[PDB]
Amino acid sequence: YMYGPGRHHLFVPGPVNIPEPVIRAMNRNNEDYRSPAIPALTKTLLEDVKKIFKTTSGTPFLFPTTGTGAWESALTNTLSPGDRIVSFLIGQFSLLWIDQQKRLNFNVDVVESDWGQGANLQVLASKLSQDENHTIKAICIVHNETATGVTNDISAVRTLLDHYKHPALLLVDGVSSICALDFRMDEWGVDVALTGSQKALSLPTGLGIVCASPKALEATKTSKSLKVFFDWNDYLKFYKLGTYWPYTPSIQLLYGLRAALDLIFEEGLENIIARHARLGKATRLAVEAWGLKNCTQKEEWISNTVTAVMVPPHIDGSEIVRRAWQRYNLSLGLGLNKVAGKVFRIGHLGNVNELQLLGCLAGVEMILKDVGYPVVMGSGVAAASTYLQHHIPLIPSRI
Amino acid sequence: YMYGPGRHHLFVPGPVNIPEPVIRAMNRNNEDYRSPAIPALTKTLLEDVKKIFKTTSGTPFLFPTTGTGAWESALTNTLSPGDRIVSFLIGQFSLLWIDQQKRLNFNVDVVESDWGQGANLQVLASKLSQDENHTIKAICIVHNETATGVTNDISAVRTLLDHYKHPALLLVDGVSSICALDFRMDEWGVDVALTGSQKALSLPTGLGIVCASPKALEATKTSKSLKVFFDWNDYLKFYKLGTYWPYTPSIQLLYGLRAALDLIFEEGLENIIARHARLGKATRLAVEAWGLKNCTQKEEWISNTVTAVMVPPHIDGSEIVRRAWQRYNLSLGLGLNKVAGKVFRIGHLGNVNELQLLGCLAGVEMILKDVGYPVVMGSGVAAASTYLQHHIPLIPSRI
Amino acid sequence: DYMYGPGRHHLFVPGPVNIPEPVIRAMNRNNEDYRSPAIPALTKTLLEDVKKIFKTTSGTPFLFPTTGTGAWESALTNTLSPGDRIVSFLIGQFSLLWIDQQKRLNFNVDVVESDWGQGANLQVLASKLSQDENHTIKAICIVHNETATGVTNDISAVRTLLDHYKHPALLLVDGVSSICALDFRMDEWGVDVALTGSQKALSLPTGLGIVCASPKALEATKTSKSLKVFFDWNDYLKFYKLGTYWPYTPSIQLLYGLRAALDLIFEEGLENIIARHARLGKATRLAVEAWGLKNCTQKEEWISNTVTAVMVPPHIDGSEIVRRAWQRYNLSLGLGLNKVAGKVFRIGHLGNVNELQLLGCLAGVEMILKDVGYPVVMGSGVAAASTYLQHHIPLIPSRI
Amino acid sequence: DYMYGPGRHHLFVPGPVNIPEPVIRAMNRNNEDYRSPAIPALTKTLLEDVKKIFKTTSGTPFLFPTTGTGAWESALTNTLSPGDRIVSFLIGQFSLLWIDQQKRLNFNVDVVESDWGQGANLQVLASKLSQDENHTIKAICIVHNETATGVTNDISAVRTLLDHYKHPALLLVDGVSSICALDFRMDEWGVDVALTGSQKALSLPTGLGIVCASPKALEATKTSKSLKVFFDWNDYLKFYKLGTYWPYTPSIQLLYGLRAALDLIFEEGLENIIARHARLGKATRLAVEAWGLKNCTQKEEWISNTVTAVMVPPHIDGSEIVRRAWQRYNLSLGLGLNKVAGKVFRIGHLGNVNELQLLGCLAGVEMILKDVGYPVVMGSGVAAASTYLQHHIPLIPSRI
Numbered sequence A, B: 001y002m003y004g005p006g007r008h009h010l011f012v013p014g015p016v017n018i019p020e021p022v023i024r025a026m027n028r029n030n031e032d033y034r035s036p037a038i039p040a041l042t043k044t045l046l047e048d049v050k051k052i053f054k055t056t057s058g059t060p061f062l063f064p065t066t067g068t069g070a071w072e073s074a075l076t077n078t079l080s081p082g083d084r085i086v087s088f089l090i091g092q093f094s095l096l097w098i099d100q101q102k103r104l105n106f107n108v109d110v111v112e113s114d115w116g117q118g119a120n121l122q123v124l125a126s127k128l129s130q131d132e133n134h135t136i137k138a139i140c141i142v143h144n145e146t147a148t149g150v151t152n153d154i155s156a157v158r159t160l161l162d163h164y165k166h167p168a169l170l171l172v173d174g175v176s177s178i179c180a181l182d183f184r185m186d187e188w189g190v191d192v193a194l195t196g197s198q199k200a201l202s203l204p205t206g207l208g209i210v211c212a213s214p215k216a217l218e219a220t221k222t223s224k225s226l227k228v229f230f231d232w233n234d235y236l237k238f239y240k241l242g243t244y245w246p247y248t249p250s251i252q253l254l255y256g257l258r259a260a261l262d263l264i265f266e267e268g269l270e271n272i273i274a275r276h277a278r279l280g281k282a283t284r285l286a287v288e289a290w291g292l293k294n295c296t297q298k299e300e301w302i303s304n305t306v307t308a309v310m311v312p313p314h315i316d317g318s319e320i321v322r323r324a325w326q327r328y329n330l331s332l333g334l335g336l337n338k339v340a341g342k343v344f345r346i347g348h349l350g351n352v353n354e355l356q357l358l359g360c361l362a363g364v365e366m367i368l369k370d371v372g373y374p375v376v377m378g379s380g381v382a383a384a385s386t387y388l389q390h391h392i393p394l395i396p397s398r399i
Numbered sequence C, D: 001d002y003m004y005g006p007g008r009h010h011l012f013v014p015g016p017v018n019i020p021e022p023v024i025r026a027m028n029r030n031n032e033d034y035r036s037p038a039i040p041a042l043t044k045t046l047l048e049d050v051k052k053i054f055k056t057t058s059g060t061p062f063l064f065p066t067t068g069t070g071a072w073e074s075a076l077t078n079t080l081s082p083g084d085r086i087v088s089f090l091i092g093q094f095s096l097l098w099i100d101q102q103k104r105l106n107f108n109v110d111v112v113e114s115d116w117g118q119g120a121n122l123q124v125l126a127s128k129l130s131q132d133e134n135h136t137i138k139a140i141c142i143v144h145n146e147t148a149t150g151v152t153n154d155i156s157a158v159r160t161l162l163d164h165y166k167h168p169a170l171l172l173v174d175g176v177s178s179i180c181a182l183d184f185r186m187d188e189w190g191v192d193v194a195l196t197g198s199q200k201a202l203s204l205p206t207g208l209g210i211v212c213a214s215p216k217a218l219e220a221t222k223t224s225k226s227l228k229v230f231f232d233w234n235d236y237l238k239f240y241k242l243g244t245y246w247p248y249t250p251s252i253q254l255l256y257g258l259r260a261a262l263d264l265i266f267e268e269g270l271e272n273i274i275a276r277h278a279r280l281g282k283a284t285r286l287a288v289e290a291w292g293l294k295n296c297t298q299k300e301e302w303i304s305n306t307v308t309a310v311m312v313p314p315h316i317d318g319s320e321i322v323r324r325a326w327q328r329y330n331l332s333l334g335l336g337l338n339k340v341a342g343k344v345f346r347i348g349h350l351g352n353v354n355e356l357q358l359l360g361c362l363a364g365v366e367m368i369l370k371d372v373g374y375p376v377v378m379g380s381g382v383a384a385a386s387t388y389l390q391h392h393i394p395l396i397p398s399r400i
């Protein structure tokens, strides 16, 4: 369409780069999803999916939908209209989840934080202490707010729920974190965890992956919200029958997920988490060398999947995004809603290595000069490469 | 996984064969859906999509979902809980749509027909005549029942509604018909028409395409059903903003749809419809030469996208499907629910030519012999090839 | 997408052939550095596995980035010197083209000619070997499978005559349209240079000319005074020793493609692949018999299970059948070449193709025969093929 | 997926190079019948468009299914006879290998040698032309861009000396690592045979050796007594007349790939591609200067915009830099070959690659230099390149 020379530099926090082996696995004609091959393939995907959530008790569902669809499935299967939810508004995507909760006629207790801050767990503790009659039925929290680069502590939420002996369900949006940050469903007692295929899993859009605890499944018996396409029970019915699929899945995405999981296990989930931590640290060091500000306001909330960069008031962050596309064949994340024009976002998420990031960072330095910001050329690249030269591990397959 | 020699013969009525040019168009890395390229691509898809529905007034929506999801979008955007619907139970998929309607708390007047018969429009006429107060808010009808190979006359439904001056909405499932059978949204006054990508469009699963009339859009103002992921209003909001996408689409399916539409227009929609008619006629001639019975009970309901073949009571149609897979590398459609074991289904839908079908038909003759049915070898192939030799047009690009 | 037609194109020429989906996937890749550690490691496994399809433990394979005609040229220039006497057999277009090349490289070719549709004249070979008391015949150049005629030669019979007369001539065999489809036993038959092309039964794109040389062939390179650089085996042998294998740049995509192709061949089983080709060839020949047409091959001992050359009656132009197949049925059939131009058309049945694919082609040919005015009985050829195949198609082991 | 590493592999060897996504898509296809009407129609357009990248209206192109070394061989055997005197210039590994081939084909090669890092010695050429009163020199064989050294020769200067002495020798130019990256003017320079390979600036897989011959070169085929069949131009010219173009099977996938590659070249613009390569080469040379290392190229008139050969100090092994790049950074750099083995490493910058890709590589090289104990100032080379590129990168026209 709008071709540019060389390889496009995709550094938005989703969709992310797809590894070549996964592209190959998806390069295939359709197949009959009622043939014996697809149920056999599906069975291996469900079992291996539990490993990336770090659950042995959870039941996964591979919905042909997006992350927004995964949201809807989590809410309508476990809750009823009028049920009271506590959720945390800290950015665009936590906001959009709350907008959805209200639109599905749930009573949402919204706990707001300034953009760049994490969930206000003190207000949470206060609301749980005062909930004698257990009216709060669920906590809905985004693990990683993609709009601001803020990661919340899920274990602290569990500590509060257990401290007050509160039975509320814990629903966690891990779209921007699972397979990039550490995520421990069982240890944290997460009841519904969800992610999307186009983030750290490094696949096309089209899978909304939902993992439910035994507690979450028992809650479906009481749930009076309406659902059909997103109903877990129809999937459970076909799991028992051995066919798994109540309606047609995407054959290509299933084989793609098989190849993505194989690559994840070959690198090692722990090594993937460490890789993201290196990339995020390197990016944050570059941002400080530029004299710019990370939108995250405290170190405890730093995000290793995206860095939201604040520019001074005379610089338009949207112009930085526009110039990256028009001149450097580079995709950067826009500042959304409240931070529109005030930030641009560097995604460091999924299948990406250090030299790819350094190319992006070098390009940002040229863009900032184009818009009149007085950056010392190479200062951010040098801060990142100096740190990375100490920590990049050798590629095991090549030792 | 379970590899077999040669090319797999995919003759289920969905998913269907993907043309090589479409496979190539989808062979690509992710892209930023907020970059200028994707809105530009999307605009051309929405405009060209209207041509296959044969609408100039309708508004299309490209949902990242399946046909079942398209169903849900059509119902929750135009109707409210408790609203009275008339629907026709004639097969598995019309049944599943009714199951969904009931699960979303609509009052469904179910008009049942025996499997192999079309919608009972006499009962419909009777119910419309008696609806003085216009309590019936919508008619939900499957255009082509994939489980039985039955095509209903949509124009007759419009004739009845107009005769009685009845304002009910007309929602039509065209998953199994659009781009294969003739479909005229505006002429028939269809208010919501929907199809899936994995049928005649010959794409992977993952797009539920919904097209709404101005009347359908006005009904959203009154609709009190709950929806977020399937809400048309959020799409309309982003159409006006010029970004089109309220959440992430599948980049690969959008480019795939662009290539699929280009191929459809190059062959010509009218020529595609005639091609399907040839394949269906050829299959029905072969079934009679075999001495077997078409499940469709009257000629007026014949389907040119799938032929449901009835076997005698001592033959297990599921064994025919099983042997096709294990020995001939051939996928045939199973008999579903009420016709389980009594039929098998030959799909002739999407991007498939005459020699492909003749290969399938020759294989069925060998399978029937394997299960003890006394078929005269070549009798069905000969009946089909004798008819096709008179009607196959020359390939225009090669004249 | 040029000259697009609906549905999948039916490729039934005897080369290039259909590529299995997994092989297409394997080649769907960016370039890689051929001097990086990955490519030598990959090449190592291909050379060892390629020996299996030749059925040799003695031979040394070479994966030339070239076509079948280039493999021809390397076979000749590495083992022979100008003026060397060669015995070759003209039985069709491709045995003719090899002989044309032999002459153009200034070899003294003794041409043993047969009618098109017949195999090599071994009685004439015997007398020539019997008269060659001073061993002036340096090589026998014979095509294993003549793709223009559908004729397969008995390679073991040539080795028998060579051994009977105690003649030391090298045995150079073109197996472009036979290896991995017909049985081929390099060591058992004492073949000194065997060659094939990637776009035939291997079911790959064009671009690899695969040559396998016996120790005697390698010994012959020491006395060979023909000129060669691109096709020189010694350059490959040197880089084999060095461990990097490639004296110049190979096709990265074809190396990975060949890896996937060999994996599929070993999964199905080579003996099972040979049997599958036997089924397809017999089914096709039965269809031809049912149609009332004639096989170009004149005797049963010469029938080819990779291609069938069909002779049409005098009032039909075989080229019209090929054109009609392309213009109306999205079907590719082989033309009659040179001597048999217009008198025949060719149905290729080799590589990764199954029985229902072939039956679709055969059904299409019946419709074409009707188009061009041949009084075919519709279904007669399909019924003969299906009646036979319903008895012999094995169950797919992967599906129990 | 062998020896897998995270993220995208950074391919910065000077061949094979990165393939544009649309070209990968174009080659993602099953085989087709090369005797069907589609392939000749496609080939027709490729031959006419290929002339544009050579900047010739007189020349005849040939798309051989071979590598650069095969294009070499065809250039020689079609225009020269054994014993013919050739003047060639040994300035690096690939000019050396061509000379090695010239000798092995029994030509009388007059070798004009220069130190690695220097261009062709034209003063010696002048004296040789001046002494050749009887026109015994039949051809000048010169490499346009020596990929082993990063040295570009002035082809127009050779034509000037040829015309000054009124010498009729043919001008054979290797443009494997120059055409579609550096400027190349076949007609203006009077080049008689120009050749390139697909895996270089054309940004395709290996498998096409593209040769373009002037009318004088074609006239020379009439007197050429070198032996050739696979590489013979006359076989192609005959099928050109017949309208089918191919004397043997081509690679279907590479034909469609070349179609897409040429479409991309015309869309960006050839002059814009030449300018882009100039930017990448200058940026790389600036980085090298900032690092305190030396360019192997000894004079500014010889600098190459397709590859930079970097000389390392005596306490560093250049091969260790290449190994480290592969083992830790998923980066492919070029080795120093033969004479400059261990003394240099090579950064390739040609084909479909943009500035941010190069800058990522340059940033990686700085980290490698630190690993092997070179006192590099982190960011110094990136800053020099970025400071220059921020001035010269053009806006992408497709994006207004």
Ligand SMILES: Cc1ncc(COP(=O)(O)O)c(C=O)c1O
Pocket: A014, A066, A067, A068, A069, A093, A142, A144, A145, A146, A173, A174, A175, A176, A196, A205, B247, B248
């Ligand atoms: C944290 C988070 N949740 C939810 C979403 C919505 O996902 P999708 O666009 O796939 O609907 C996103 C964005 O992709 C996200 O970053």
Ligand SMILES: Cc1ncc(COP(=O)(O)O)c(C=O)c1O
Pocket: A247, A248, B014, B066, B067, B068, B069, B093, B142, B144, B145, B146, B173, B174, B175, B176, B196, B205
């Ligand atoms: C007529 C009809 N409607 C609806 C559906 C359901 O579509 P999907 O499987 O994509 O959810 C099908 C089957 O695909 C169908 O044939």
Ligand SMILES: Cc1ncc(COP(=O)(O)O)c(C=O)c1O
Pocket: C015, C067, C068, C069, C070, C094, C143, C145, C146, C147, C174, C175, C176, C177, C197, C206, D248, D249
């Ligand atoms: C038996 C035989 N030998 C040689 C050749 C020539 O091979 P290629 O076209 O790959 O150069 C062919 C044609 O494919 C052939 O069938």
Ligand SMILES: Cc1ncc(COP(=O)(O)O)c(C=O)c1O
Pocket: C248, C249, D015, D067, D068, D069, D070, D094, D143, D145, D146, D147, D174, D175, D176, D177, D197, D206
């Ligand atoms: C200038 C030059 N000439 C010739 C060659 C040899 O070409 P090939 O490796 O494709 O045979 C090369 C290497 O690519 C080269 O760089």
Ligand SMILES: [Cl-]
Pocket: C014, C015, C147, C148, C334
């Ligand atoms: Cl042929």
Ligand SMILES: [Cl-]
Pocket: D014, D015, D147, D148, D334
């Ligand atoms: Cl090189």
